[PDB]
Symmetry: D2
């Protein structure tokens, strides 16, 4: 039954990932190294998160927290073998502490382990030793990273690393060095855990065991907007080598009938980061980016060197999108009169016309509520400096079509 068949449809089952350890390790010094804008105050980011999480449960939406998913999953000796088998090598940990680290973890509670598998494993967290203690000399005298296992403070944006796309999902070959260790854990979930091992569903593209090279795909850039149409933001973090490959997979399994490729200006971002549906016929938009997007339609045609053909659409993205859906016009609330500045994109839809956005985009939020949209609010004090919104912070596994 699993499958996201639109963006605005009714949401039922979403993954998400509260902040936590991974972030506790952050540090002005390590911020960028670690790929996270600003050191947040973890305790309250967790409160605020679960908070957002609740306003979603209180609507009868099944919220899965990666953290549980991971904790359950590794209660299966085989899966756990599976993660560790890949997550502790002479190449990532170092040959001098592969057995040390492994056994330590293997020797912790189901919960304290999932924590570390996400938030990471400092040398400190290990019992005295020769080796653990050369890594402490390293971080100490010269200030090297003391990470056996590196934190993934970006797990908390679950949107990015996998995509439910109709009756199936992609395991995403991430852009930046750090996040690539994300896609693995989530694979192990989809792969072992009892709500999926049983699930009927295909894996469109991806595999944490291959090396994907220049091919990267990030959830943000993927939009299954129904009618068998997939939006893909291409250019910045998701690439032609990657896209065109999903394109053909989707096509070669009657998942989707046409992808529409959103070419994103470089001269960092994600589609949904500048384009966000709220209602059947309405989208939040970051002007200055969108008005410079260049559309291209991939389509199944047996007379292509690949089974695909590609047009340059003749209309603006908004026009092309407008049609693809069976519409003529797209209601547009552009952000990016005005009290102050906010960016109100990257909102998530719980249902046709129901949106969760930030407690701070006050101007945008009354326009949204002026276009007849109900806005659930959550707090952007900390989750906000992570540059992520509601849409970034969720991963739809189950969402209805809009006929």
């Amino acid at each position: 039954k699993l499958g996201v068949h639109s963006e605005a449809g009714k949401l039922r089952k979403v993954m998400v990932c509260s902040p936590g350890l991974a972030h506790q390790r952050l540090t002005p010094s390590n911020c960028d190294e670690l790929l996270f804008d600003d050191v947040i105050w973890v305790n309250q980011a967790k409160r605020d998160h679960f908070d957002f999480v609740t306003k979603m449960r209180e609507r009868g939406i099944d919220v899965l927290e990666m953290h549980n998913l991971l904790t359950e999953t590794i209660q299966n000796p085989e899966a756990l073998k599976w993660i560790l088998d890949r997550k502790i090598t002479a190449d990532s940990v170092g040959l001098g502490l592969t057995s040390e680290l492994r056994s330590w973890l293997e020797s912790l509670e189901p919960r304290k382990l999932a924590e570390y598998l996400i938030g990471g494993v400092a040398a400190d967290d290990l019992p005295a030793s020769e080796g653990a203690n050369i890594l402490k000399m390293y971080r100490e005298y010269l200030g090297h990273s003391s990470f056996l296992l590196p934190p993934l403070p970006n797990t908390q944006f679950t949107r990015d690393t996998t995509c439910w796309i109709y009756g199936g999902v992609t395991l995403n070959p991430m852009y930046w060095p750090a996040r690539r260790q994300e896609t693995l854990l989530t694979t192990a979930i989809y792969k072992f855990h009892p709500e999926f091992a049983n699930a009927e569903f295909e894996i469109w593209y991806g595999d944490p065991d291959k090396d994907h090279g220049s091919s990267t795909l990030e959830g943000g850039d993927v939009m299954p907007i129904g009618n068998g149409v997939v939006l893909i933001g291409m250019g910045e973090r998701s690439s032609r080598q990657a896209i065109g490959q999903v394109a053909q997979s989707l096509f070669a399994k009657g998942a989707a009938e046409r992808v529409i490729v959103a070419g994103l200006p470089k001269s960092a971002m994600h589609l949904a980061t500048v384009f966000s549906f709220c209602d059947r016929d309405l989208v939040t938009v970051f002007p200055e980016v969108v008005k410079e997007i260049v559309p291209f339609s991939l389509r199944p045609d047996p007379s292509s060197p690949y089974g695909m053909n590609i047009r340059r659409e003749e209309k603006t993205f908004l026009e092309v999108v407008a049609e693809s859906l069976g519409l003529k016009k797209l209601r547009v609330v552009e952000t990016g009169e005005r009290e102050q500045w906010d960016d109100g994109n990257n909102v998530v839809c719980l249902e046709p016309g129901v949106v969760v956005g930030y407690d701070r985009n006050t101007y945008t939020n009354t326009l949204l509520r002026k276009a007849g949209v109900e806005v659930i609010t959550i707090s952007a004090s900390e989750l906000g400096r992570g540059r992520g919104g509601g849409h970034c912070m969720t991963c739809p596994i189950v969402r209805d079509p809009i006929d």
Copy 2:
């Protein structure tokens, strides 16, 4: 032939080089930072300058192998070309619009010209008019993307850190920057296929263009066979511990070396051969603000431990540790970039041809004078273009045959 690197100062007999070309012709003040080069150069002059520096060495009895010649030569054996094309041209690298079109093209080129493109990349530009290539042309022009089917490798120039020769073997280096991994494939290719290397006897201590490697990153500039069964491996920005840890036990496992000295580099910018370079049996240059901040580690073999290695931390200054290691009372040292320095200059990264015989940059006139004072012959070449590459005689060389001392 018996290939090996048994020192930093020894008589140099065989060097690999690569001159600037199509790679650097492709540089622009806006594509040059993602391309991992520092500044646009006068390619046509850099060449004249590089052929100068290549010739100055050859004129001294030394074999100098041009990468481009070597590849161009390798590119002839269809087993080889195939062996490269199969791993360079694939969907993840090129995409499904282009592979055939691309390789089909590639293979239709004359050999020499194929290695040009192999080092310097290939834009849509260069491919024949095609549905496919135009999309890319129209992605570039319209959306500001890159036309790069195969991406230029302006850094090949820097054959030093793309592979090291540690005594009777070479390491296939897993590069730091996702930009330069593409490089290793080519050298390896040469080492495996080129008449000169295929028949030669030598080990492969560490590496494989066919395995990922993750956090293990080893760059050659960081590696120093200083003779006396010791290896100095700088551990800083480019060379991680996972790689060093391994290249270590592979060296020990075959009595290639006795002692590895991890040069602990503070926070992570440049190679070790960049603040610290050799000159004579007993002379070294030193970026003092950095050298003086290293923390030396002695990493020896041990049957007494699981991983047959033991690692102790050393209280003497790095210079001292190195002294001890060469059986030496202590090193004569000339510092580079406050006294009667007429103007600022960085003298390091000079290459030895042989003890007391060295190549550095013309412009570094204050340092190169000391070098002379301390009794070294200093041969110069033009910094004007080569040096704006942020790299000197050392970085630009990858020794293959160099005699030990004494």
Copy 3:
């Protein structure tokens, strides 16, 4: 009790402060680049945060005076307003085509508003339809220009930097950056006209909004009258030896101070009080990484010297020298950046052993309590994305000898 700050830990009687305003509402990601601000903030939220802060000080006695507030009142004095306007409104600053228009509209202004804009600044869309403003409205939209006629001063928020008080007297600081120079004009015209300041006794040690100072900068964060005739100034950063030399010299000449300790800081690119702050008579927090690098120097008078003083190097740690400087045996130091990273420097002393900090710094704030210190907290979430803490967000005017 005359106006004067005579310690750092001592009893806090009168401080000045400035809450997030119009200047912050103007921040958009594309310009807080160049207005010396790290992020764009919820402004409504920040005001709350700042008020809370305020109350928490006031509800304990402190005479808290708010810039906007004092400036509003100041303006009501026609002579004062002209003073300000003759200077903020030039042809070098606003421009030939817009000096009349923009001044004339400003005086049409109701005071609470007029001042709202002095700190917050004027863009060309607060202006009456006009030809001259339109080429601006024009410049900014087509050629992506700074449309601002008067620059927004988000930083006035940090009242400690624009002026210090040093025992009986005040320095009006020649800010470093250009994003901030403007700031002092306003504070100067307050001390100068405002009723409250205009009449009582105090000295001007250093500085003049009128004068072009050159490579002389001095930022308040860098000048701590620790009391006991001693004055530490942190030099090398925002605060240059060209000012410091002179502050010191006037301080000796008017005998505000017996000794100036230059806490020469290692160049980088961070005031002194963002790395080393007082919690108690014998207590400081301390960003150990930066502190352990400071090289102290001692300035003293010298009746017989040319320049009225004679500086010499201090052999013990900076910290040891401060210590022996207030005649303590040893300063208890607490460091700051075990369960997540923490920076809790920059707490302000409301009295000996009572400070204001941020709620996010629980580790450090924990130690501080253990140090015999009671810690009032306020919310960082927005106030602390600023760049500042209790110590930045306050300019003490009246604080007791310790």
Copy 4:
């Protein structure tokens, strides 16, 4: 005895260049950022390329003046020296501790060198031994602080910038970066005392080292006197409307020129940097930015307060410029087959004859295609200065064309 620049293309007659000097020697990788230079160049070799340049003009009958010679000639007149020093050396720049020593030192020096140091700076080291200087070396090493009593001015090599000639008047410009206002002083003085100047005729439309010019910042490179009372002036990030407007309102009111076309630059260059003349109707541009600039015609008007009107244009800048030179349209070569180069910033020794960089083979060829003789200087060093011949020159006397 009269001077001026009545075009860009006319027979050049008098140019002021400045050869890379002691200041370039002072450049270190970790300092050349705050000095505002883009690379530590090889001085001796910049020095020889620059001369080569100097000579190559000197041979086509041009009279070149070096800023080092002229500064020299100047400061031998004691009053011009007193005149500079009293401004160059103050307690706000050299610091009370040193003015005395520092000034009494230079005065002891011979011309050739004393000038040398002005353009070059002077660090503690250079000072004769003294308690004063060492406490500066003290800071330098121990603390990383500058120890420059006087600032190095390695940008002096770019004379186009500091002073403009426009039709028998000249602007002594208020430079953008603090790190460069120090030149204006020096050139100003030469023009004010040196017999080659103090005696000729010409006005001073805009400029005074003395005044503080708020946001009014103007640079030569943004200013082109093209011919019949048309002055191009790019208003961007370097040249500010605050001046631009004064500079016009001075030009008109004095008969000097009949229109300014403000060349509106996108955010973040000099005009002469993306747009340059090689002949009566021949220019090189840089399409990324030339294509996207919004001109403005600025002309005099009796029927208005500030006595000017600005109409925006809809025609492209290139077009605007053509219609004001009275030409059908503009012949255009675009730069910025083999490899990338920006062939721009070429300077005209006469109409159709120009000096560019030798590296730029490609553009040189199009230019040669277009009927320009292209005399070339090396780029290996002077090129890392980011500027070309246009940059490296100060048209003092140049013939009109219409």
